[PDB]
């Protein structure tokens, strides 16, 4: 079938690919919105092919991906694979920790695949299609096959988007700590890695103050515990944790701790987990299932089990009372780390609801919590971190990935976004510059990061030179005076409007074909327009201003719009931004 | 002599008797689709119209033997009818409730025919089994090793439900139901043909002393709480009461955790000194071992990182398993690294402590996960049980195992699954002869009928703490006539008369039974014949011999008739054709005959030596 709008244009086209209980129910929820409920139910896979269309048609949403484009680009052929929370760090086939079955068109069509579907997603570049599949074979989906979805058609991309988000996604009711929207977060992970210890945390805190930076908080990362699954400090690397936390308090540092859902087989807590039955089980529901993650082999906690939830929460509360820790970084949470076939205390026909149940563990510590997964987690009022970025320039987890990823996550109704580490994680063989991100990549990244809801340093500015430190202090000051006040105001609006903080250009210019295509610019609310340099050896870039009057950061009033500003000057130590007038 | 129809077939012998009948239960044939080319009869279509690879190939391997190869490939089910009351069947699996001949009780949906622990289940199949059924009418069936074979039964129509399926089963693909039905002149000749065709004979013989002197086990006496003091007290008490020993078997638990191989120093302060003392008192010693490593073993981490364990289906991670001693992984005996690793630890215990051999406990695939992967794929999961039994090969002379899956050529002892201190066919005294004969049918000659008096499990013990005095005495007497004899709860736990009865049967075993067991053990390599034989072995045309579950032979010449009922000082004794000299010197030369109310005191067993 195919669908048109009131103006007569074809906005949606779909081919049946399993063959030629089916229904299409038309609904008129508003004078300007037309929705089409669709079902195909016959034991053999259902597949429908959704055509993106004639390249003037641009699409947004779906999953956080390793290679994030905006609008969405289909590369090659992909057989339908489970649309579930996966770790996308090392896979361009899989789908990332934050996703919904939601696709939005610039032609003002949108599709929400029904939550019931055992949903698998593939694609075909040749015919430019999304391959929408329901199946129960070779998949972590369990029965409780049906492909069911709703296609809606509005007047423009922004109105139809707002209708869909208000229909399907819950807004958060609370706001993270104000300081997290202004002062940089400092993380041990990229700087020190696993080898972090009591000396290194204190040296870091000293160096942060010596170079005159504020902190939202200091985040002590992997690894501070004797084994993965233990909750208390390794006394070899942390001789007197209490004294460490006292010193950090004296220097005005709030502190968070890296946590995860795993208990390795050589944790002092593994036996306790087995005997108390706190772990995700093999299919028969009798025994723990072993899992492999990047930090070894063990079990994973069952967050559908009240005993496992209270047990995890108990250890977090103890770290809080013992050390005055503010909150936690909840790492992993993807079901790609659960077994293919598993059982839990409450059955999960949809495995990704496990990811949701993990994100619930942040609720009691939400104010300075971060998670890196979201599956209908929008009403959890903590920060959502993009999956670990690499110290490269490109769309593959690099600098050019930041704006597509942040916008994608914003489309899915998560306002409080943390675009991971300034300069990336500096992984050997995945670092433009060898040991650390090259100076120019670090500077351009820092500048984009200064305009996002939360800013996190690991490799600090003073690792480079005094000019890089000066650039950092400049953008820290600019963030405090211009960006932070707006982020907080927009953060406070979310409860009422459900609108995101970081917005695509097309948000205010929904009928603008150029705004539909832009992946190099973004808005903070409707009034701040940001155009970072995202290419090396460049001291200028083309800047698109949509309809309306815009006052440049230099005081230039642009009142003949829309217009492309060609070779607009932007020095290494500058970012192009424009305020609505 | 085969009669094929749409919905099943039947077979007759040269004399004209129907000796085999089978119904197709996953469909019927289209007979217009059947064509005969010499020996081969092939059919290409079901009655429903489904395409089918079905055939029956007749083979004449000998003047007196006629075989019928059968295949059905499109879940496949055929119902094999046992027939009228006059037709008696033997073989299949060791079972919780063992009858002889085989009795079908109630309705059973086909379930995987795999090595299971039948201690607590009357549905499952035991550690020793083959897909082999033998009829008193001289028909036999061997189900093809290829089949993903599931077995059920139906009492109403008295049928075995033979099923091939790949759904809800530990069988993996590499469904086809394939088998061979053979017909001979008598039950013994057709049995001998089938055993020689399908089962390898062992080429070696266990230590002579194991066929004569009692084995002493710590398990039933002390259980888990066994320690260095208790082993030495036991050894002292064995010598104080003037008994020989094949060996002393130190059982569960002597290690700090399950998966560790060395002695718990809390319970065994100086193991070396313990073994020295046992050597000084002329004790050979064996140690209880198992295929598991619990999660709290000091060897669990080593197993995970070295990938020595049976894995979950994706083949990446160990699969956790539950056994009666806790939760952990199970060693992959298809993996050379896991085999060398296990063998390494056994060799170290040998050189360190001069241990003679090991009791290899568990070994059933009911302790592996439903769905698993191994270093080498096992379409048939029970081959894992076989690979475990191979670990006995280097220590075969005083080794025992309690599983067998084409393990016949491993020249160690095979132990019946743990017996209970009850009288009945449910792992009790009356189970001993059916079980030993069943295991003998499957070509395992060196059989150990577990512990004299059973394992004394609370709530499963006629007598409370220990087996009743009378049950213990009657059991000891029948156990004295089996290939290997094992005490745990010793005679001196009762009274001086029980000790005297033990010394009498120990002496009788040494002078009468042991010389015959050794001679018959030495014959196996040549003849492939078992040691313990059913009455019908020498009397294959004797309808009474076909039915007897209360008597057995040692070879062809020693006939044994124990009392298997409480408060009895007599029993009926059937003597088949030939002359028999009673243990009292009575010549019975008018046979076959039923000896009615034949006197057997509490301290006696009825036995008869061939005199023809
Ligand atoms: C004790 O008894 C065992 C059987 O009860 C003996 O092992 C069996 O021996 C026979 C004859 O050697 C084997 O049958 C053969 O298999 C070989 C090897 O096949 C392998 O490769 C194929 C690849 O196509 C694979 O599918 C198989 O699974 C094997 O990995 C074939 O090449 C021959 O043609 C023939 O079919 C049995 O495989 C084997 N069974 C088991 C369960 O081990 C054992 O040798 C006896 N001991 C002694 C000392 O003789
Ligand atoms: C979306 O999913 C829900 C749940 O699968 C569907 O609602 C069910 O409809 C089935 C049969 O169509 C009924 O048997 C259930 O009782 C319904 N449950 C509820 C909660 O209403 C719904 O129909 C699906 N939408 C479409 C368009 O197929
Ligand atoms: C936060 O949103 C989640 C997800 O929408 C809510 O959980 C769902 O709520 C509905 C309505 O009660 C239930 O029927 C669903 O089963 C829930 N789904 C899951 C995956 O949990 C949750 O209630 C919201 N929180 C609050 C406080 O309203
Ligand atoms: C067990 O065997 C009995 C006897 O053959 C089966 O009962 C008959 O089933 C047939 C086929 O459906 C009916 O036509 C008869 O009327 C049934 N009753 C009789 C003859 O007893 C029974 O189906 C078998 N059950 C199982 C579970 O195999
Ligand atoms: C714990 O186990 C991991 C594998 O899960 C292993 O690599 C590591 O070295 C072990 N470390 C400790 C401290 O036991
Ligand atoms: C640093 O913190 C102080 C105290 O809260 C605040 O007044 C100031 O604006 C901050 N400066 C920054 C972020 O540059
Ligand atoms: C028995 O199995 C083998 C291997 O699958 C097969 O080639 C043979 O034909 C089977 N026998 C019969 C009678 O089907
Ligand atoms: C064990 O006992 C013997 C004799 O008492 C002695 O020679 C040996 O040194 C002892 N060793 C240990 C470690 O107890
Ligand atoms: C014990 O062993 C000796 C010597 O090995 C043997 O001659 C004797 O028959 C055995 N039996 C008894 C009951 O003493």
Author numbering:
A (entry chain D): 100 to 119, 144 to 165, 169 to 270, 277 to 713
B (entry chain A): 92 to 165, 171 to 270, 277 to 714
Paper text:
We were intrigued by MYORG, which is a type II transmembrane protein predicted to be comprised of a short, disordered nucleocytoplasmic N-terminal region, a single transmembrane helix, and a lumenal C-terminal catalytic region comprising a CAZy family glycoside hydrolase 31 (GH31) catalytic domain and 2 β-sheet domains. Here, we demonstrate that MYORG, enigmatically, functions not as an α-glucosidase but rather an α-galactosidase and shows marked preference for specific disaccharide substrates.
Four copies of MYORG could be placed within the asymmetric unit (chains A to D). Analysis of the crystal structure reveals MYORG is comprised of an antiparallel β-sandwich N-terminal domain (residues 92–287), a (β/α)8-barrel catalytic domain (residues 288–633) with an insertion between α3 and α4 (residues 393–436), and a proximal β-sheet domain (residues 634–714). Five cysteine residues are present in the structure and form 2 disulphide bonds within the N-terminal domain (C125 with C134 and C158 with C284). Glycosylation is observed on every polypeptide chain in the asymmetric unit, and it is possible to model N-glycans on all of the predicted N-glycosylation sites of chains B and C. The crystal structure shows that MYORG forms a 2-fold dimeric assembly, agreeing with our SEC-MALLS analysis, with the protein–protein interaction exclusively localised to the insert region.
